[PDB]
Amino acid sequence: PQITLWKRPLVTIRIGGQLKEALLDTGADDTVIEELNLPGCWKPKLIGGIGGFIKVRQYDQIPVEIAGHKAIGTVLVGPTPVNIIGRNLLTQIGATLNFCGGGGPQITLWKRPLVTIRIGGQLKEALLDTGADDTVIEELNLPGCWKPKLIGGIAGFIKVRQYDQIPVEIAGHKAIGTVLVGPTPVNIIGRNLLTQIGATLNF
């Protein structure tokens, strides 16, 4: 299919013989699912995101059907806020990110989808994250009025400053919208701006 990003890219998956809902997440290296039992042995791991880290159980070589497409790979199980399908399985099902519906660059998911952005007259690197509702940029002295906000990721919540109507050029494509500024470990471009540049998931 081709999936646009006006809504969360939620899909049904089948795993261990059970159906679950999960978010297609280009900003996640790995696939993380809420607590459940999986056949096979597991080992302890920690994974991170906004706010730090959680403990998970790593299961290897798990079959997962994702919208009807087969994958067999690593599934982390633990207290994630949302079930996410990460790049390890997205690559198996042939998923790419495409600008302007495929008229623009195609970004494969073998490595983190990092691109150059321009914001407040600065160039920065940022991750295209279909699993992010909002755009979050590392602490940056933007002039202007802001409102406080809290946003939440794998390890908890962080406090950010919300600025509205900020232009953000993404790989040469002009967007304008809300930007959150705070202590993120990676600058994140979320769906609010991805939709403006016609970015789609395709597989």
Ligand X SMILES: CCCC[C@@H](CN[C@@H](CCCC)C(=O)N[C@@H](CCC(N)=O)C(=O)N[C@@H](CCCNC(N)=[NH2+])C(N)=O)NC(=O)[C@@H](NC(=O)[C@@H](NC(C)=O)[C@@H](C)O)[C@@H](C)CC
Question: Which residues of the shown chain bind ligand X in the complex (CB under 6 A)?
Answer: 23, 25, 27-30, 32, 47-50, 80-82, 84, 86, 129, 131-134, 136, 151-154, 184-186, 188, 190
Task: Please report how many Cα atoms fall inside a 13 Å half-sphere around the Cα of residue 170, on the Cβ side.
Answer: 30
For 177, list phi and psi in degrees, rounded to 5.
180, -160
Q: Which is nearer to ligand X, 45 or 69 (CB)?
A: 45
Q: How far is the CB of 103 from ligand X (least distance, A)?
A: 26
Q: How far is the CB of 87 from ligand X (least distance, A)?
A: 8
Q: How far is the CB of 145 from ligand X (least distance, A)?
A: 21
Q: How far is the CB of 150 from ligand X (least distance, A)?
A: 9
Contact (CB, 8 A) for 127 and 114: yes
Q: Which is nearer to ligand X, 100 or 125 (CB)?
A: 125
Find where tokens 């939440």 sit: 152
Q: Which is nearer to ligand X, 81 or 177 (CB)?
A: 81
Q: How far is the CB of 51 from ligand X (least distance, A)?
A: 9
Q: Which is nearer to ligand X, 130 or 200 (CB)?
A: 130
Contact (CB, 8 A) for 109 and 163: no
Q: Which is nearer to ligand X, 60 or 100 (CB)?
A: 60
Q: How far is the CB of 202 from ligand X (least distance, A)?
A: 20
CA distance 122 to 136: 15
Six token digits for residue 84 = 């996410």
Q: Which is nearer to ligand X, 128 or 197 (CB)?
A: 128
